[PDB]
Amino acid sequence: DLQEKLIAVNRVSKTVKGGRIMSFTALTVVGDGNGRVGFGYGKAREVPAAIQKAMEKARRNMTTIALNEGTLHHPVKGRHSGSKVYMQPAAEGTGVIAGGAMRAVLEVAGVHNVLSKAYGSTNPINIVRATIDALGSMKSPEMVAAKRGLTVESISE
RNA sequence: AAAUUGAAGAGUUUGAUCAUGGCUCAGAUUGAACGCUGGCGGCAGGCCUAACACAUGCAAGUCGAGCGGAAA
Ligand SMILES: CN[C@@H]1[C@H](O)[C@H](NC)[C@H]2O[C@@]3(O)C(=O)C[C@@H](C)O[C@H]3O[C@@H]2[C@H]1O
């Protein structure tokens, strides 16, 4: 499987005695639409090579997230650098109500119904890190019951 | 039974960066106005300004089973 999205391309510069070496950063996200998601950030002097590098990096850095059949089990907060993300489970039909970067991550991860907001910096590179920080923080009701030595019933009763 | 199902961001400071932080934009709205354009219908709405000044007509009469009457 592995759906791969390109969140951002950006032209960066190193100043040099000559003039300016201009290069390209690519922020990509990969996942299986069913719990795995990874990001990759690649650099190169050509755009295709950056995307390629990012994709390769992404594949290696993928991570399980506990989803509730296309939504979250509970609300989560993420933070990275100055980017803060809130995401909340939603009813089916809602769609991914996330903003930029955050929606790419949620697409490939397999979230179809979520409510989001991104506070603070909306810098793609940081949002993506916050989003996957948050998706990492999610636990299934079973996991939460396992940890508290109770049953899914008793947790919710 | 139901009385809800709800939350998007982008541009712009730098050679580049990340932050901070303004500014700006996408939405919805309206007793609107203006420009261009303009077929019909239904239902609403229509001096937000000068509590400015107002021509003209009209917007509070009715009762003869209260009364003397009798203009017609
Ligand atoms: C004195 N010779 C210089 C010296 O080799 C410089 N490197 C320290 C060399 O640097 C270059 O190669 C550069 O990259 C910068 C450019 C302006 O000059 C080029 O030619 C520069 C040469 O002219």
Side-chain angles (χ1 to χ4, degrees):
Chain A
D1 288 1
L2 295 193
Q3 322 153 24
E4 315 199 351
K5 303 206 182 197
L6 172 67
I7 302 205
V9 171
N10 173 52
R11 193 173 69 243
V12 291
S13 173
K14 184 185 172 179
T15 293
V16 291
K17 188 155 193 169
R20 281 168 193 172
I21 300 175
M22 311 177 202
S23 300
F24 293 99
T25 71
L27 178 63
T28 73
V29 175
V30 174
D32 65 348
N34 248 296
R36 289 215 175 191
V37 52
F39 72 103
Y41 178 82
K43 303 174 56 53
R45 287 192 181 176
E46 308 163 27
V47 178
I51 304 178
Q52 178 176 356
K53 283 185 198 175
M55 293 308 184
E56 290 153 350
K57 171 178 166 178
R59 295 156 188 172
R60 307 153 197 169
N61 306 351
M62 281 205 307
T63 307
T64 301
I65 70 169
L67 292 188
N68 192 20
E69 314 170 7
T71 193
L72 315 189
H73 296 287
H74 52 84
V76 278
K77 285 178 180 170
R79 190 176 176 171
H80 188 274
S81 166
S83 297
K84 311 162 189 184
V85 299
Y86 172 77
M87 297 178 290
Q88 183 185 77
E92 190 171 0
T94 306
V96 172
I97 306 193
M102 191 153 47
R103 63 205 326 300
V105 175
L106 289 164
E107 278 145 8
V108 309
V111 172
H112 294 122
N113 309 288
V114 53
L115 296 159
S116 307
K117 182 65 187 190
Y119 307 98
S121 190
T122 51
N123 190 349
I125 63 175
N126 292 317
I127 290 288
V128 177
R129 283 175 181 262
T131 301
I132 296 176
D133 156 49
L135 298 175
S137 73
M138 286 192 298
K139 298 182 169 183
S140 70
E142 306 171 1
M143 289 157 58
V144 173
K147 143 248 277 192
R148 293 163 62 185
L150 288 177
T151 68
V152 174
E153 326 121 23
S154 50
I155 297 306
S156 52
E157 171 262 346

PDB file of all heavy atoms in Angstrom, chain A residues 5-39:
ATOM      1  N   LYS A   5       2.125  11.526   0.411  1.00  0.00           N
ATOM      2  CA  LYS A   5       1.767  12.885   0.040  1.00  0.00           C
ATOM      3  C   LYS A   5       2.963  13.794   0.249  1.00  0.00           C
ATOM      4  O   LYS A   5       3.790  13.532   1.107  1.00  0.00           O
ATOM      5  CB  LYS A   5       0.543  13.384   0.806  1.00  0.00           C
ATOM      6  CG  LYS A   5      -0.663  12.499   0.633  1.00  0.00           C
ATOM      7  CD  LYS A   5      -2.012  13.182   0.804  1.00  0.00           C
ATOM      8  CE  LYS A   5      -3.124  12.175   0.661  1.00  0.00           C
ATOM      9  NZ  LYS A   5      -4.431  12.791   0.410  1.00  0.00           N
ATOM     10  N   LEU A   6       3.042  14.844  -0.573  1.00  0.00           N
ATOM     11  CA  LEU A   6       4.047  15.879  -0.438  1.00  0.00           C
ATOM     12  C   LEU A   6       3.418  17.084   0.246  1.00  0.00           C
ATOM     13  O   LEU A   6       2.657  17.815  -0.381  1.00  0.00           O
ATOM     14  CB  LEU A   6       4.576  16.249  -1.818  1.00  0.00           C
ATOM     15  CG  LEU A   6       5.500  17.465  -1.879  1.00  0.00           C
ATOM     16  CD1 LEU A   6       6.806  17.202  -1.169  1.00  0.00           C
ATOM     17  CD2 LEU A   6       5.727  17.812  -3.325  1.00  0.00           C
ATOM     18  N   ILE A   7       3.792  17.319   1.504  1.00  0.00           N
ATOM     19  CA  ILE A   7       3.233  18.412   2.268  1.00  0.00           C
ATOM     20  C   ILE A   7       3.791  19.734   1.772  1.00  0.00           C
ATOM     21  O   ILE A   7       3.039  20.691   1.636  1.00  0.00           O
ATOM     22  CB  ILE A   7       3.478  18.226   3.766  1.00  0.00           C
ATOM     23  CG1 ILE A   7       2.879  16.897   4.221  1.00  0.00           C
ATOM     24  CG2 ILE A   7       2.952  19.439   4.552  1.00  0.00           C
ATOM     25  CD1 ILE A   7       2.507  16.823   5.685  1.00  0.00           C
ATOM     26  N   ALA A   8       5.101  19.821   1.574  1.00  0.00           N
ATOM     27  CA  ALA A   8       5.692  21.102   1.233  1.00  0.00           C
ATOM     28  C   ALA A   8       6.994  20.917   0.474  1.00  0.00           C
ATOM     29  O   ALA A   8       7.744  19.977   0.733  1.00  0.00           O
ATOM     30  CB  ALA A   8       5.904  21.902   2.485  1.00  0.00           C
ATOM     31  N   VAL A   9       7.228  21.825  -0.478  1.00  0.00           N
ATOM     32  CA  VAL A   9       8.542  22.043  -1.046  1.00  0.00           C
ATOM     33  C   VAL A   9       8.923  23.485  -0.784  1.00  0.00           C
ATOM     34  O   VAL A   9       8.072  24.366  -0.801  1.00  0.00           O
ATOM     35  CB  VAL A   9       8.565  21.708  -2.537  1.00  0.00           C
ATOM     36  CG1 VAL A   9       9.855  22.135  -3.210  1.00  0.00           C
ATOM     37  CG2 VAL A   9       8.351  20.229  -2.742  1.00  0.00           C
ATOM     38  N   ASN A  10      10.203  23.707  -0.522  1.00  0.00           N
ATOM     39  CA  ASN A  10      10.678  25.009  -0.128  1.00  0.00           C
ATOM     40  C   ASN A  10      12.067  25.173  -0.712  1.00  0.00           C
ATOM     41  O   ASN A  10      12.819  24.211  -0.753  1.00  0.00           O
ATOM     42  CB  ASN A  10      10.593  25.161   1.381  1.00  0.00           C
ATOM     43  CG  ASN A  10      11.240  26.432   1.875  1.00  0.00           C
ATOM     44  OD1 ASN A  10      10.926  27.525   1.383  1.00  0.00           O
ATOM     45  ND2 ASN A  10      12.121  26.323   2.861  1.00  0.00           N
ATOM     46  N   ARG A  11      12.352  26.375  -1.224  1.00  0.00           N
ATOM     47  CA  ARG A  11      13.663  26.705  -1.753  1.00  0.00           C
ATOM     48  C   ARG A  11      14.441  27.377  -0.630  1.00  0.00           C
ATOM     49  O   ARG A  11      13.939  28.325  -0.026  1.00  0.00           O
ATOM     50  CB  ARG A  11      13.534  27.577  -3.009  1.00  0.00           C
ATOM     51  CG  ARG A  11      14.827  27.715  -3.800  1.00  0.00           C
ATOM     52  CD  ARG A  11      14.640  28.441  -5.127  1.00  0.00           C
ATOM     53  NE  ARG A  11      14.333  29.871  -4.968  1.00  0.00           N
ATOM     54  CZ  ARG A  11      13.206  30.483  -5.347  1.00  0.00           C
ATOM     55  NH1 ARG A  11      12.070  29.804  -5.455  1.00  0.00           N
ATOM     56  NH2 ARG A  11      13.204  31.794  -5.543  1.00  0.00           N
ATOM     57  N   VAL A  12      15.623  26.834  -0.318  1.00  0.00           N
ATOM     58  CA  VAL A  12      16.489  27.369   0.728  1.00  0.00           C
ATOM     59  C   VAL A  12      17.800  27.786   0.084  1.00  0.00           C
ATOM     60  O   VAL A  12      18.041  27.437  -1.060  1.00  0.00           O
ATOM     61  CB  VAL A  12      16.707  26.334   1.836  1.00  0.00           C
ATOM     62  CG1 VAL A  12      15.433  26.106   2.623  1.00  0.00           C
ATOM     63  CG2 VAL A  12      17.256  25.015   1.305  1.00  0.00           C
ATOM     64  N   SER A  13      18.632  28.521   0.826  1.00  0.00           N
ATOM     65  CA  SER A  13      19.843  29.114   0.276  1.00  0.00           C
ATOM     66  C   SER A  13      20.975  29.043   1.297  1.00  0.00           C
ATOM     67  O   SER A  13      20.760  29.364   2.459  1.00  0.00           O
ATOM     68  CB  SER A  13      19.581  30.534  -0.148  1.00  0.00           C
ATOM     69  OG  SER A  13      20.783  31.186  -0.538  1.00  0.00           O
ATOM     70  N   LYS A  14      22.165  28.634   0.837  1.00  0.00           N
ATOM     71  CA  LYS A  14      23.437  28.902   1.506  1.00  0.00           C
ATOM     72  C   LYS A  14      24.159  30.009   0.736  1.00  0.00           C
ATOM     73  O   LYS A  14      24.382  29.864  -0.461  1.00  0.00           O
ATOM     74  CB  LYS A  14      24.203  27.575   1.496  1.00  0.00           C
ATOM     75  CG  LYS A  14      25.510  27.545   2.206  1.00  0.00           C
ATOM     76  CD  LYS A  14      26.255  26.226   2.052  1.00  0.00           C
ATOM     77  CE  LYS A  14      27.641  26.341   2.638  1.00  0.00           C
ATOM     78  NZ  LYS A  14      28.377  25.080   2.537  1.00  0.00           N
ATOM     79  N   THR A  15      24.495  31.121   1.403  1.00  0.00           N
ATOM     80  CA  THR A  15      25.282  32.177   0.767  1.00  0.00           C
ATOM     81  C   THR A  15      26.728  31.730   0.734  1.00  0.00           C
ATOM     82  O   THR A  15      27.203  31.124   1.685  1.00  0.00           O
ATOM     83  CB  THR A  15      25.116  33.507   1.503  1.00  0.00           C
ATOM     84  OG1 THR A  15      23.756  33.887   1.291  1.00  0.00           O
ATOM     85  CG2 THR A  15      26.031  34.602   0.985  1.00  0.00           C
ATOM     86  N   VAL A  16      27.407  32.033  -0.376  1.00  0.00           N
ATOM     87  CA  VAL A  16      28.781  31.612  -0.626  1.00  0.00           C
ATOM     88  C   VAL A  16      29.523  32.745  -1.315  1.00  0.00           C
ATOM     89  O   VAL A  16      28.897  33.685  -1.805  1.00  0.00           O
ATOM     90  CB  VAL A  16      28.787  30.356  -1.491  1.00  0.00           C
ATOM     91  CG1 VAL A  16      28.263  29.163  -0.720  1.00  0.00           C
ATOM     92  CG2 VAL A  16      28.006  30.559  -2.780  1.00  0.00           C
ATOM     93  N   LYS A  17      30.855  32.635  -1.378  1.00  0.00           N
ATOM     94  CA  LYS A  17      31.675  33.707  -1.921  1.00  0.00           C
ATOM     95  C   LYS A  17      31.270  33.975  -3.367  1.00  0.00           C
ATOM     96  O   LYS A  17      31.160  35.139  -3.753  1.00  0.00           O
ATOM     97  CB  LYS A  17      33.175  33.431  -1.831  1.00  0.00           C
ATOM     98  CG  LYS A  17      34.036  34.623  -2.230  1.00  0.00           C
ATOM     99  CD  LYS A  17      35.430  34.646  -1.617  1.00  0.00           C
ATOM    100  CE  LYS A  17      36.109  35.966  -1.798  1.00  0.00           C
ATOM    101  NZ  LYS A  17      37.329  36.038  -0.993  1.00  0.00           N
ATOM    102  N   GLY A  18      31.027  32.898  -4.138  1.00  0.00           N
ATOM    103  CA  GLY A  18      30.423  33.010  -5.459  1.00  0.00           C
ATOM    104  C   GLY A  18      29.164  33.886  -5.435  1.00  0.00           C
ATOM    105  O   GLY A  18      29.218  35.075  -5.759  1.00  0.00           O
ATOM    106  N   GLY A  19      28.031  33.277  -5.056  1.00  0.00           N
ATOM    107  CA  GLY A  19      26.796  34.002  -4.803  1.00  0.00           C
ATOM    108  C   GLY A  19      25.932  33.291  -3.769  1.00  0.00           C
ATOM    109  O   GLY A  19      25.991  33.631  -2.590  1.00  0.00           O
ATOM    110  N   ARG A  20      25.137  32.309  -4.231  1.00  0.00           N
ATOM    111  CA  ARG A  20      24.103  31.668  -3.418  1.00  0.00           C
ATOM    112  C   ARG A  20      23.814  30.275  -3.963  1.00  0.00           C
ATOM    113  O   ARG A  20      23.259  30.156  -5.054  1.00  0.00           O
ATOM    114  CB  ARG A  20      22.804  32.480  -3.470  1.00  0.00           C
ATOM    115  CG  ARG A  20      22.795  33.706  -2.572  1.00  0.00           C
ATOM    116  CD  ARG A  20      21.646  34.636  -2.834  1.00  0.00           C
ATOM    117  NE  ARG A  20      21.887  35.918  -2.164  1.00  0.00           N
ATOM    118  CZ  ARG A  20      21.162  37.025  -2.297  1.00  0.00           C
ATOM    119  NH1 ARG A  20      20.169  37.092  -3.179  1.00  0.00           N
ATOM    120  NH2 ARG A  20      21.431  38.073  -1.531  1.00  0.00           N
ATOM    121  N   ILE A  21      24.180  29.236  -3.205  1.00  0.00           N
ATOM    122  CA  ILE A  21      23.782  27.867  -3.534  1.00  0.00           C
ATOM    123  C   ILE A  21      22.321  27.689  -3.132  1.00  0.00           C
ATOM    124  O   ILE A  21      22.023  27.648  -1.942  1.00  0.00           O
ATOM    125  CB  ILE A  21      24.683  26.845  -2.826  1.00  0.00           C
ATOM    126  CG1 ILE A  21      26.141  27.012  -3.220  1.00  0.00           C
ATOM    127  CG2 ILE A  21      24.187  25.424  -3.085  1.00  0.00           C
ATOM    128  CD1 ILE A  21      27.107  26.107  -2.463  1.00  0.00           C
ATOM    129  N   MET A  22      21.423  27.564  -4.113  1.00  0.00           N
ATOM    130  CA  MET A  22      20.002  27.399  -3.825  1.00  0.00           C
ATOM    131  C   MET A  22      19.659  25.916  -3.934  1.00  0.00           C
ATOM    132  O   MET A  22      20.072  25.260  -4.882  1.00  0.00           O
ATOM    133  CB  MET A  22      19.130  28.240  -4.764  1.00  0.00           C
ATOM    134  CG  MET A  22      19.580  29.692  -4.875  1.00  0.00           C
ATOM    135  SD  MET A  22      18.620  30.681  -6.042  1.00  0.00           S
ATOM    136  CE  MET A  22      19.798  31.998  -6.396  1.00  0.00           C
ATOM    137  N   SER A  23      18.942  25.403  -2.931  1.00  0.00           N
ATOM    138  CA  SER A  23      18.586  23.995  -2.828  1.00  0.00           C
ATOM    139  C   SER A  23      17.112  23.873  -2.466  1.00  0.00           C
ATOM    140  O   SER A  23      16.429  24.884  -2.349  1.00  0.00           O
ATOM    141  CB  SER A  23      19.459  23.313  -1.823  1.00  0.00           C
ATOM    142  OG  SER A  23      20.825  23.402  -2.207  1.00  0.00           O
ATOM    143  N   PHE A  24      16.631  22.635  -2.298  1.00  0.00           N
ATOM    144  CA  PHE A  24      15.207  22.355  -2.172  1.00  0.00           C
ATOM    145  C   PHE A  24      14.982  21.381  -1.027  1.00  0.00           C
ATOM    146  O   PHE A  24      15.655  20.366  -0.926  1.00  0.00           O
ATOM    147  CB  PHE A  24      14.646  21.791  -3.471  1.00  0.00           C
ATOM    148  CG  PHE A  24      14.647  22.801  -4.592  1.00  0.00           C
ATOM    149  CD1 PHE A  24      15.653  22.798  -5.546  1.00  0.00           C
ATOM    150  CD2 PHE A  24      13.655  23.773  -4.670  1.00  0.00           C
ATOM    151  CE1 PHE A  24      15.663  23.738  -6.561  1.00  0.00           C
ATOM    152  CE2 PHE A  24      13.662  24.704  -5.695  1.00  0.00           C
ATOM    153  CZ  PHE A  24      14.665  24.683  -6.642  1.00  0.00           C
ATOM    154  N   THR A  25      14.029  21.718  -0.172  1.00  0.00           N
ATOM    155  CA  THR A  25      13.599  20.857   0.907  1.00  0.00           C
ATOM    156  C   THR A  25      12.235  20.305   0.530  1.00  0.00           C
ATOM    157  O   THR A  25      11.416  21.044  -0.008  1.00  0.00           O
ATOM    158  CB  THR A  25      13.543  21.681   2.188  1.00  0.00           C
ATOM    159  OG1 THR A  25      12.427  22.541   2.024  1.00  0.00           O
ATOM    160  CG2 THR A  25      14.793  22.513   2.407  1.00  0.00           C
ATOM    161  N   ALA A  26      12.004  19.021   0.810  1.00  0.00           N
ATOM    162  CA  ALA A  26      10.706  18.403   0.579  1.00  0.00           C
ATOM    163  C   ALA A  26      10.219  17.756   1.867  1.00  0.00           C
ATOM    164  O   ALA A  26      10.937  16.949   2.442  1.00  0.00           O
ATOM    165  CB  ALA A  26      10.810  17.380  -0.521  1.00  0.00           C
ATOM    166  N   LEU A  27       9.002  18.107   2.291  1.00  0.00           N
ATOM    167  CA  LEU A  27       8.386  17.519   3.466  1.00  0.00           C
ATOM    168  C   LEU A  27       7.316  16.578   2.972  1.00  0.00           C
ATOM    169  O   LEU A  27       6.372  17.027   2.341  1.00  0.00           O
ATOM    170  CB  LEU A  27       7.806  18.635   4.349  1.00  0.00           C
ATOM    171  CG  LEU A  27       7.075  18.196   5.620  1.00  0.00           C
ATOM    172  CD1 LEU A  27       7.980  17.478   6.598  1.00  0.00           C
ATOM    173  CD2 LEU A  27       6.435  19.388   6.285  1.00  0.00           C
ATOM    174  N   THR A  28       7.490  15.284   3.208  1.00  0.00           N
ATOM    175  CA  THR A  28       6.532  14.307   2.726  1.00  0.00           C
ATOM    176  C   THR A  28       6.009  13.518   3.902  1.00  0.00           C
ATOM    177  O   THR A  28       6.606  13.528   4.975  1.00  0.00           O
ATOM    178  CB  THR A  28       7.144  13.385   1.678  1.00  0.00           C
ATOM    179  OG1 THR A  28       8.018  12.495   2.363  1.00  0.00           O
ATOM    180  CG2 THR A  28       7.860  14.153   0.581  1.00  0.00           C
ATOM    181  N   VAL A  29       4.874  12.855   3.677  1.00  0.00           N
ATOM    182  CA  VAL A  29       4.267  11.991   4.661  1.00  0.00           C
ATOM    183  C   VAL A  29       3.769  10.747   3.955  1.00  0.00           C
ATOM    184  O   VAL A  29       3.246  10.834   2.858  1.00  0.00           O
ATOM    185  CB  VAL A  29       3.152  12.714   5.420  1.00  0.00           C
ATOM    186  CG1 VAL A  29       2.434  11.791   6.367  1.00  0.00           C
ATOM    187  CG2 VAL A  29       3.722  13.853   6.226  1.00  0.00           C
ATOM    188  N   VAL A  30       3.978   9.602   4.598  1.00  0.00           N
ATOM    189  CA  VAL A  30       3.619   8.313   4.061  1.00  0.00           C
ATOM    190  C   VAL A  30       2.808   7.584   5.106  1.00  0.00           C
ATOM    191  O   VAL A  30       3.114   7.673   6.279  1.00  0.00           O
ATOM    192  CB  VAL A  30       4.893   7.538   3.718  1.00  0.00           C
ATOM    193  CG1 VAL A  30       4.597   6.111   3.289  1.00  0.00           C
ATOM    194  CG2 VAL A  30       5.686   8.252   2.634  1.00  0.00           C
ATOM    195  N   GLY A  31       1.842   6.788   4.669  1.00  0.00           N
ATOM    196  CA  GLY A  31       1.201   5.840   5.559  1.00  0.00           C
ATOM    197  C   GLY A  31       0.282   4.897   4.806  1.00  0.00           C
ATOM    198  O   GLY A  31      -0.033   5.137   3.646  1.00  0.00           O
ATOM    199  N   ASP A  32      -0.245   3.910   5.533  1.00  0.00           N
ATOM    200  CA  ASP A  32      -0.955   2.787   4.940  1.00  0.00           C
ATOM    201  C   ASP A  32      -2.474   2.981   5.009  1.00  0.00           C
ATOM    202  O   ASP A  32      -3.215   2.034   4.761  1.00  0.00           O
ATOM    203  CB  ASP A  32      -0.555   1.497   5.630  1.00  0.00           C
ATOM    204  CG  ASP A  32      -0.952   1.389   7.097  1.00  0.00           C
ATOM    205  OD1 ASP A  32      -1.363   2.425   7.675  1.00  0.00           O
ATOM    206  OD2 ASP A  32      -0.833   0.275   7.662  1.00  0.00           O
ATOM    207  N   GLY A  33      -2.936   4.178   5.407  1.00  0.00           N
ATOM    208  CA  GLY A  33      -4.360   4.468   5.519  1.00  0.00           C
ATOM    209  C   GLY A  33      -5.050   3.659   6.620  1.00  0.00           C
ATOM    210  O   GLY A  33      -6.272   3.516   6.589  1.00  0.00           O
ATOM    211  N   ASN A  34      -4.279   3.154   7.591  1.00  0.00           N
ATOM    212  CA  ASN A  34      -4.806   2.232   8.580  1.00  0.00           C
ATOM    213  C   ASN A  34      -3.841   2.100   9.746  1.00  0.00           C
ATOM    214  O   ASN A  34      -3.554   0.988  10.185  1.00  0.00           O
ATOM    215  CB  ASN A  34      -5.132   0.869   7.957  1.00  0.00           C
ATOM    216  CG  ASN A  34      -6.619   0.588   7.928  1.00  0.00           C
ATOM    217  OD1 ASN A  34      -7.248   0.482   8.988  1.00  0.00           O
ATOM    218  ND2 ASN A  34      -7.199   0.449   6.741  1.00  0.00           N
ATOM    219  N   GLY A  35      -3.365   3.236  10.271  1.00  0.00           N
ATOM    220  CA  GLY A  35      -2.680   3.233  11.550  1.00  0.00           C
ATOM    221  C   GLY A  35      -1.203   3.597  11.456  1.00  0.00           C
ATOM    222  O   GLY A  35      -0.655   4.095  12.427  1.00  0.00           O
ATOM    223  N   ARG A  36      -0.538   3.289  10.339  1.00  0.00           N
ATOM    224  CA  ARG A  36       0.860   3.659  10.186  1.00  0.00           C
ATOM    225  C   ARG A  36       0.954   5.018   9.508  1.00  0.00           C
ATOM    226  O   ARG A  36       0.188   5.301   8.590  1.00  0.00           O
ATOM    227  CB  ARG A  36       1.638   2.610   9.408  1.00  0.00           C
ATOM    228  CG  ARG A  36       1.862   1.317  10.174  1.00  0.00           C
ATOM    229  CD  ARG A  36       3.215   0.743   9.822  1.00  0.00           C
ATOM    230  NE  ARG A  36       3.562  -0.442  10.610  1.00  0.00           N
ATOM    231  CZ  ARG A  36       4.771  -1.021  10.663  1.00  0.00           C
ATOM    232  NH1 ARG A  36       5.845  -0.431  10.137  1.00  0.00           N
ATOM    233  NH2 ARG A  36       4.905  -2.194  11.274  1.00  0.00           N
ATOM    234  N   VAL A  37       1.873   5.860   9.991  1.00  0.00           N
ATOM    235  CA  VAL A  37       2.186   7.130   9.352  1.00  0.00           C
ATOM    236  C   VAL A  37       3.617   7.491   9.713  1.00  0.00           C
ATOM    237  O   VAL A  37       4.008   7.365  10.868  1.00  0.00           O
ATOM    238  CB  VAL A  37       1.227   8.279   9.733  1.00  0.00           C
ATOM    239  CG1 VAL A  37       1.065   8.441  11.245  1.00  0.00           C
ATOM    240  CG2 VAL A  37       1.632   9.607   9.096  1.00  0.00           C
ATOM    241  N   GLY A  38       4.370   7.975   8.726  1.00  0.00           N
ATOM    242  CA  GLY A  38       5.689   8.543   8.952  1.00  0.00           C
ATOM    243  C   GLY A  38       5.877   9.808   8.130  1.00  0.00           C
ATOM    244  O   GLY A  38       5.258   9.958   7.081  1.00  0.00           O
ATOM    245  N   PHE A  39       6.711  10.718   8.625  1.00  0.00           N
ATOM    246  CA  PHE A  39       7.099  11.878   7.845  1.00  0.00           C
ATOM    247  C   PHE A  39       8.561  11.711   7.458  1.00  0.00           C
ATOM    248  O   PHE A  39       9.306  10.982   8.110  1.00  0.00           O
ATOM    249  CB  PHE A  39       6.800  13.189   8.568  1.00  0.00           C
ATOM    250  CG  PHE A  39       7.696  13.491   9.746  1.00  0.00           C
ATOM    251  CD1 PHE A  39       8.727  14.416   9.639  1.00  0.00           C
ATOM    252  CD2 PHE A  39       7.493  12.859  10.963  1.00  0.00           C
ATOM    253  CE1 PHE A  39       9.544  14.692  10.725  1.00  0.00           C
ATOM    254  CE2 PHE A  39       8.311  13.133  12.048  1.00  0.00           C
ATOM    255  CZ  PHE A  39       9.334  14.049  11.930  1.00  0.00           C
TER     256      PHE A  39
END
